[PDB]
Amino acid sequence: WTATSGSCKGRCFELQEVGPPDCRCDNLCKSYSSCCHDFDELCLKTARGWECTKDRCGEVRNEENACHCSEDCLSRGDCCTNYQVVCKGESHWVDDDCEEIKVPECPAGFVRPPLIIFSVDGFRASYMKKGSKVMPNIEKLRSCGTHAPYMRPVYPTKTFPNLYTLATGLYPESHGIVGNSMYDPVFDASFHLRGREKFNHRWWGGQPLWITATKQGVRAGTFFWSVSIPHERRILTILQWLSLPDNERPSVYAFYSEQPDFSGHKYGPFGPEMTNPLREIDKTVGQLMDGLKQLRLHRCVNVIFVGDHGMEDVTCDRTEFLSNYLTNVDDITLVPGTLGRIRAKSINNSKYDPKTIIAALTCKKPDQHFKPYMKQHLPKRLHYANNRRIEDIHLLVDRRWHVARKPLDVYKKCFFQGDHGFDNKVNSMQTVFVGYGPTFKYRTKVPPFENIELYNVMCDLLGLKPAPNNGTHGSLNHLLRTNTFRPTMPDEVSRPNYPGIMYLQSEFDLGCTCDDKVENKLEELNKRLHTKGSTKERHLLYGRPAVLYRTSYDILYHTDFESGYSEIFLMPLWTSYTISKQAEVSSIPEHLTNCVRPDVRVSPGFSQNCLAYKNDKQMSYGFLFPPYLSSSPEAKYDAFLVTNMVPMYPAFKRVWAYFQRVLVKKYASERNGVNVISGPIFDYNYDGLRDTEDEIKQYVEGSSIPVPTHYYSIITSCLDFTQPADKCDGPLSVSSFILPHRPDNDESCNSSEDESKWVEELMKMHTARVRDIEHLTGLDFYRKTSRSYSEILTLKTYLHTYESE
Ligand SMILES: *[C@@H]1O[C@H](CO)[C@@H](O[C@@H]2O[C@H](CO)[C@@H](O[C@@H]3O[C@H](CO[C@H]4O[C@H](CO)[C@@H](O)[C@H](O[C@H]5O[C@H](CO)[C@@H](O)[C@H](O)[C@@H]5O[C@H]5O[C@H](CO)[C@@H](O)[C@H](O)[C@@H]5O)[C@@H]4O)[C@@H](O)[C@H](O[C@H]4O[C@H](CO)[C@@H](O)[C@H](O)[C@@H]4O[C@H]4O[C@H](CO)[C@@H](O)[C@H](O)[C@@H]4O)[C@@H]3O)[C@H](O)[C@H]2NC(C)=O)[C@H](O)[C@H]1NC(C)=O
Ligand SMILES: CN(Cc1ccc(C#N)c(Cl)c1)C(=O)Cn1cnc2ccc(C3CCN(C(=O)[C@@H]4CCO4)CC3)cc2c1=O
Ligand SMILES: [Ca+2]
Ligand SMILES: [Ca+2]
Ligand SMILES: [Cl-]
Ligand SMILES: [K+]
Ligand code: NA
Ligand SMILES: [Zn+2]
């Protein structure tokens, strides 16, 4: 109930929403059907449109008009945005040259430069180039300010998850807006773009920018907008709020546009009908900038022009149907479209089998345009699992395609030519970022980055302390002239032991054997030097990784590699080695095929054992430093140390052996040497964070050897590849992966073929940021380089995507 018979007189677009059953006059009242009876009349004036004309100049004020051209309009803050242009001989902002804003140039009483966020729905990254001739205001923002070639959205590349990520710095799994629709099994409720359910705060986790601001005494404008408020009225409203008295005026403002997404769905991303919505958004930017310039705020405000996602060509005839795969299609519920999420139709049905649903969807047709996953098996880079609203079964849909349950779902609602939602690596889903203002740099291009990073920057722009989030604060300092943020390296929590030779061979009863007894003081002092760290500056190029949690571990030096060996998990946490461009690949000699050697630096009680592997019929083992890349037949024995061994399913060993035998050397040839850090990851509760020992769900049978859920590698080289990895004077170049440690290769449909046809494709799919590995391991990398820490933070957030140009 609303008693809608109150009034908006003097309250139009008020900033504090009032409580029921009193009626509302704020920019959301339309969405709630709760506006006062006279909201349209008072607050949504339209008379005479949105522009001053020569004959309105100096007119007598008429309060019915949408905006004003009377002499008093500037002091009242309600001129049409082109008033000064028409009536005072001023130039449009877009026609002025650009001039560096070295300091904020703000009116008296401004405590800080306001931040205006201009969000554009469906604004694909390549519109910046392709629509450039029709977007002069946007092009000026872009060339004069700071811009990236593109900005990476979060998965799914849908509207609500991305806008709320922009606002919180959090992955959708953490903020809870995990799709444009979602069902919460605990609420027994569905959230949709349509309806009132989305109004309940219980869906919305984290701490969005407006709350962060309010909590810290910085006033915020409303970020949501009712769809029926036209764009021109949104701009005028922001400009009027900017003319409020100092004590009442917000410091942060948000404009949102439904375009070009709305037309993109109907016409496809580059339909000839798309030129107009781009012109219209540009005109709106032009209104805002002219309005700012009128208010002498155009060299005071920081403006962020940002999109939520791109748009891909998608049509009804490219729909895969689940009824084509399953027999039991009526026992499931599917969230359809550019992703699939599958759950049972009924909790009461105990004969619903996720396992058999997956198997019936796996590699079933040779052209198949989607791939089923248990959510914990999805690439870790998507961070799309740790929420009860994300269904156990997920379908990753090929770009340009849809999935639907049954044909009747498509024809009983061709409508659309565009859609989005696909994997956030997909070129068509990339979106835009421009920052313009005194705090941003002048005429600067920055590399692409992820939208999860922006919250920290917007907090910096506003002098706020960010709430805990998924950005890496400092990784975007290079966007800013001032207000940076001074990041510092986390303190190491556990210092390593450096064990010497402490155990005799016969103390070990590991059930291991090696053919290693073949009998010199030239090469005996030499071997000793290597065990004490003589070659360590060759194989550990960026310092040892810091351990950021409490644990017991040892540093182990070898001729060819260094490792940090965990006495708790009985295997290395990291193993580091450098492979020059000139290095040779050799085989594992026949006599050494099953060789595992006790490590006389590490106690029997802190070692793995061969017997456990013998008895575990599912589980085999591999090595972290690859024997194939030994520097000499003699150094090769070090690779068979029990301290270099890790548990591996035979199916996974096919992947790992190809990476180690073929791909490392390829990368070293292509990149002029690489440094490799490899290790296990344990994430049994799929939260993206390192497991404690008591979270491990699987061990090598009858042992305390825990089984990794994943294996990582971080592969670093010189960005200037004319310099070798091991003697690089400048910036670095990195690629990394987090491969799932699976007992089958069901994920790869061509796995029956030679490794050269599928392994590298798998690794590419599981590309990762260094930062993702850091969360999953509690390690901190690149502790000792000659680069600035801000630069290292940018390097740790880099993702190598393997998309074409
Ligand atoms: C990305 O960034 C984010 C933000 O930094 C990282 O997320 C944080 O991770 C922390 C560790 O997992 C986590 O801290 C825990 O919080 C518990 C308190 O939780 C509430 O309070 C906060 C603060 O205001 C709030 O933000 C939380 O919000 C969640 O829940 C509501 C729903 O109720 C949602 O609206 C919201 O979207 C959010 O959901 C997400 O998080 C939860 C987990 O909290 C997931 O389950 C969801 O799926 C979703 O992702 C909460 O409202 C606190 O209780 C925890 O403490 C336990 O653990 C410690 C170990 O140190 C121990 O000392 C304690 O004893 C305690 O154990 C007891 O509870 C156990 C669990 O019930 C029980 O089994 C035991 O036996 C004990 O009794 C813990 O400190 C933090 O909440 C989230 N924050 C957010 C916003 O998600 C995220 O990790 C980053 N991602 C990556 C990849 O880096
Ligand atoms: C497309 N769109 C642009 C946009 C702009 C910014 C973001 C973002 N972020 C999003 Cl997702 C979207 C819209 O505004 C559409 N739209 C229209 N009317 C609404 C009315 C009420 C609400 C509620 C949601 C919960 N509320 C919070 O305070 C959460 C509880 C904590 O915050 C109160 C307001 C939401 C909407 C809404 O989403
Ligand atoms: Ca959108
Ligand atoms: Ca975990
Ligand atoms: Cl969705
Ligand atoms: K075995
Ligand atoms: Na397969
Ligand atoms: Zn859309």
Side-chain angles (χ1 to χ4, degrees), residues 1-412 414-518 520-805:
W1 191 272
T2 307
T4 64
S5 62
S7 168
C8 292
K9 181 198 127 64
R11 299 169 58 192
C12 278
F13 293 103
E14 62 196 349
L15 293 160
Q16 291 143 46
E17 158 214 333
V18 287
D22 341 321
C23 61
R24 293 165 64 155
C25 305
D26 65 281
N27 70 346
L28 301 184
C29 67
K30 292 291 219 193
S31 291
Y32 295 81
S33 279
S34 64
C35 304
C36 301
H37 69 260
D38 53 6
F39 181 84
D40 287 341
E41 175 196 7
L42 296 177
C43 311
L44 300 174
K45 282 162 193 154
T46 50
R48 311 204 52 189
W50 311 111
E51 287 167 20
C52 292
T53 52
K54 284 111 161 212
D55 57 286
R56 289 190 65 175
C57 294
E59 84 197 337
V60 186
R61 170 165 296 259
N62 189 336
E63 298 275 23
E64 254 173 30
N65 286 331
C67 48
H68 304 281
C69 314
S70 44
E71 208 48 48
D72 64 348
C73 70
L74 285 173
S75 64
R76 285 281 301 275
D78 62 10
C79 313
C80 300
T81 62
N82 72 336
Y83 167 74
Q84 287 204 134
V85 167
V86 181
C87 303
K88 303 270 200 275
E90 267 295 0
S91 58
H92 291 285
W93 174 80
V94 63
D95 297 307
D96 301 331
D97 286 349
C98 84
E99 298 301 321
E100 192 166 6
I101 313 165
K102 300 199 187 144
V103 296
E105 295 168 24
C106 291
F110 280 76
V111 66
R112 79 173 61 79
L115 173 60
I116 299 175
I117 302 160
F118 191 106
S119 287
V120 282
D121 195 354
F123 202 103
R124 175 174 176 166
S126 56
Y127 289 160
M128 288 298 186
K129 176 201 245 64
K130 298 163 76 56
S132 62
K133 265 55 143 53
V134 315
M135 297 193 297
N137 285 283
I138 291 160
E139 198 41 58
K140 189 188 166 181
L141 289 175
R142 192 195 81 109
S143 54
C144 295
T146 301
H147 79 280
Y150 55 93
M151 182 176 70
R152 188 182 308 119
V154 286
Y155 187 75
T157 54
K158 296 297 201 172
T159 298
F160 277 58
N162 279 273
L163 298 171
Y164 201 54
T165 282
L166 285 155
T168 56
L170 296 173
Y171 296 120
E173 72 177 4
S174 291
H175 65 55
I177 312 302
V178 307
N180 267 348
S181 64
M182 354 168 226
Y183 168 76
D184 184 299
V186 169
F187 304 157
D188 185 34
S190 286
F191 172 115
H192 329 264
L193 296 119
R194 301 273 166 212
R196 310 187 72 83
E197 186 45 38
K198 84 170 177 302
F199 305 160
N200 189 318
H201 289 204
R202 73 194 182 166
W203 298 94
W204 303 82
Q207 189 183 91
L209 185 70
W210 53 91
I211 298 301
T212 304
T214 296
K215 292 188 185 273
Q216 289 175 49
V218 173
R219 198 159 320 108
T222 326
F223 280 48
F224 303 101
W225 283 92
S226 301
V227 68
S228 52
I229 308 158
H231 294 192
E232 297 86 346
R233 169 60 55 198
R234 295 181 204 190
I235 297 305
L236 287 164
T237 293
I238 289 161
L239 296 163
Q240 187 71 70
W241 287 330
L242 277 162
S243 309
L244 285 171
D246 300 332
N247 78 291
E248 287 156 61
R249 180 176 67 239
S251 291
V252 56
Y253 299 85
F255 171 85
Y256 171 74
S257 165
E258 298 80 11
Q259 286 288 34
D261 178 86
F262 182 74
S263 293
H265 279 287
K266 299 168 106 308
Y267 304 119
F270 309 105
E273 299 84 352
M274 293 306 297
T275 290
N276 282 337
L278 293 178
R279 293 184 181 282
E280 283 313 308
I281 300 153
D282 197 79
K283 176 175 201 189
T284 301
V285 174
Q287 294 174 348
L288 172 63
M289 298 314 293
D290 285 350
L292 295 178
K293 173 180 182 193
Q294 285 198 156
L295 300 183
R296 286 176 306 98
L297 284 174
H298 65 306
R299 303 174 48 85
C300 171
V301 169
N302 289 303
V303 175
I304 284 172
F305 184 85
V306 61
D308 54 357
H309 55 66
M311 183 68 67
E312 174 61 279
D313 293 290
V314 184
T315 52
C316 302
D317 62 327
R318 297 197 290 279
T319 307
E320 287 261 11
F321 297 95
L322 288 190
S323 55
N324 290 348
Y325 294 79
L326 308 169
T327 53
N328 64 305
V329 103
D330 289 324
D331 292 283
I332 69 165
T333 293
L334 165 81
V335 189
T338 49
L339 47 159
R341 306 211 295 279
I342 290 170
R343 62 184 186 280
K345 209 141 140 65
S346 176
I347 358 136
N348 307 147
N349 187 32
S350 42
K351 243 148 257 158
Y352 164 86
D353 209 317
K355 270 185 261 291
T356 72
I357 294 140
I358 304 275
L361 298 169
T362 298
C363 307
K364 284 299 127 88
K365 311 270 161 57
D367 264 0
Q368 199 172 304
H369 307 274
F370 65 95
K371 190 190 292 304
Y373 285 87
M374 284 303 291
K375 63 184 175 166
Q376 73 277 13
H377 294 156
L378 284 168
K380 301 294 269 181
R381 58 181 171 84
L382 304 167
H383 293 288
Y384 194 68
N386 184 208
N387 197 282
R388 73 205 187 205
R389 309 168 183 167
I390 299 167
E391 283 86 348
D392 290 349
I393 302 179
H394 198 79
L395 310 184
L396 274 186
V397 180
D398 283 2
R399 70 185 81 190
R400 298 168 48 81
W401 285 76
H402 274 172
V403 68
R405 192 173 55 108
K406 297 196 282 205
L408 80 77
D409 296 353
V410 160
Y411 65 84
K412 300 259 245 210
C414 179
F415 339 83
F416 56 81
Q417 294 179 268
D419 204 357
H420 55 85
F422 302 110
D423 190 338
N424 65 333
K425 80 172 181 184
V426 169
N427 274 342
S428 61
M429 299 297 92
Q430 304 312 294
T431 186
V432 293
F433 170 81
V434 173
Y436 176 91
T439 312
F440 282 109
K441 296 181 161 170
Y442 176 63
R443 298 189 174 277
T444 291
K445 175 183 205 189
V446 298
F449 61 88
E450 298 191 338
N451 71 349
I452 57 170
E453 300 302 331
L454 275 176
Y455 172 75
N456 280 336
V457 169
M458 292 187 289
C459 284
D460 288 343
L461 290 168
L462 293 165
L464 297 172
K465 179 190 168 170
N469 62 99
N470 303 129
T472 293
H473 196 171
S475 75
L476 296 192
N477 278 6
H478 62 288
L479 275 63
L480 301 177
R481 165 191 304 272
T482 70
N483 292 31
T484 31
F485 155 72
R486 260 109 56 119
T488 51
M489 293 189 173
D491 297 322
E492 182 146 33
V493 171
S494 298
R495 62 159 206 285
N497 308 299
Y498 300 87
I501 304 173
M502 298 155 54
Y503 301 91
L504 293 176
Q505 179 77 20
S506 59
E507 293 187 74
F508 291 90
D509 179 26
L510 302 180
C512 297
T513 69
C514 183
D515 183 32
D516 64 342
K517 347 266 195 175
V518 192
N520 178 33
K521 286 184 238 158
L522 317 167
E523 299 184 51
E524 266 174 282
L525 177 52
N526 237 2
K527 96 195 161 196
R528 262 168 261 150
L529 295 184
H530 297 332
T531 311
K532 316 265 187 140
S534 84
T535 63
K536 88 187 135 170
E537 347 287 347
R538 176 105 220 293
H539 293 303
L540 191 78
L541 298 176
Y542 322 104
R544 64 175 170 78
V547 177
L548 305 188
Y549 62 98
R550 183 68 263 168
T551 200
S552 183
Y553 77 109
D554 301 309
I555 302 301
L556 302 179
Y557 296 120
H558 318 76
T559 311
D560 290 342
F561 65 104
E562 180 176 334
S563 69
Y565 178 82
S566 172
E567 292 195 341
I568 304 314
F569 289 65
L570 311 167
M571 74 190 61
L573 300 177
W574 54 265
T575 292
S576 179
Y577 60 97
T578 297
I579 302 297
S580 82
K581 180 175 184 181
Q582 296 73 40
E584 206 162 61
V585 178
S586 52
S587 56
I588 294 171
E590 315 178 23
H591 76 287
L592 301 183
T593 301
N594 306 300
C595 166
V596 182
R597 305 170 58 240
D599 184 335
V600 295
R601 301 159 301 186
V602 174
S603 76
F606 295 130
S607 298
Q608 285 176 49
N609 73 87
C610 294
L611 187 56
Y613 291 102
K614 188 176 187 297
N615 292 339
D616 193 321
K617 292 303 181 286
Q618 325 307 316
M619 188 61 67
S620 184
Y621 65 86
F623 289 107
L624 284 176
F625 173 78
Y628 316 107
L629 289 171
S630 60
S631 57
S632 78
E634 191 191 309
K636 201 189 290 292
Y637 287 92
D638 295 346
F640 301 110
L641 289 162
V642 71
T643 46
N644 182 43
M645 194 178 54
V646 289
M648 293 189 176
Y649 289 120
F652 192 74
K653 288 176 73 186
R654 296 181 64 197
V655 176
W656 191 251
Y658 186 77
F659 160 65
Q660 285 194 321
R661 181 172 62 82
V662 178
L663 300 176
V664 177
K665 190 53 224 166
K666 190 174 95 156
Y667 307 149
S669 321
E670 289 163 1
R671 298 169 57 178
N672 189 10
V674 292
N675 174 256
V676 179
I677 300 173
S678 294
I681 276 166
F682 308 85
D683 192 18
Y684 278 99
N685 65 353
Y686 54 92
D687 68 349
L689 305 173
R690 172 198 56 93
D691 286 1
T692 48
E693 15 164 339
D694 64 7
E695 293 171 328
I696 305 307
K697 298 170 65 63
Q698 183 180 353
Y699 291 83
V700 184
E701 207 183 301
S703 71
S704 280
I705 314 171
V707 175
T709 50
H710 299 81
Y711 283 103
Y712 71 88
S713 292
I714 296 169
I715 305 180
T716 313
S717 69
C718 201
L719 185 66
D720 178 4
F721 55 106
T722 70
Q723 300 195 315
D726 69 353
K727 274 180 231 62
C728 175
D729 307 307
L732 304 178
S733 174
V734 65
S735 70
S736 302
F737 60 74
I738 303 163
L739 282 168
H741 180 216
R742 291 188 43 190
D744 60 67
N745 289 299
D746 292 350
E747 186 177 353
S748 307
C749 294
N750 294 345
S751 60
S752 75
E753 293 164 33
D754 189 65
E755 289 81 5
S756 71
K757 304 305 176 172
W758 59 276
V759 171
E760 197 177 3
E761 185 192 305
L762 180 68
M763 289 166 57
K764 290 172 188 185
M765 184 63 57
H766 292 277
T767 186
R769 311 170 305 144
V770 176
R771 200 75 187 89
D772 296 321
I773 293 166
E774 288 185 337
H775 294 316
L776 284 164
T777 59
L779 303 166
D780 188 65
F781 300 101
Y782 306 126
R783 304 274 297 180
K784 308 290 174 142
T785 72
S786 57
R787 313 309 300 174
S788 76
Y789 186 40
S790 283
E791 183 184 307
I792 287 304
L793 293 176
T794 308
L795 184 73
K796 290 183 169 190
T797 68
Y798 179 81
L799 182 69
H800 197 118
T801 45
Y802 303 107
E803 285 284 300
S804 53
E805 284 187 50

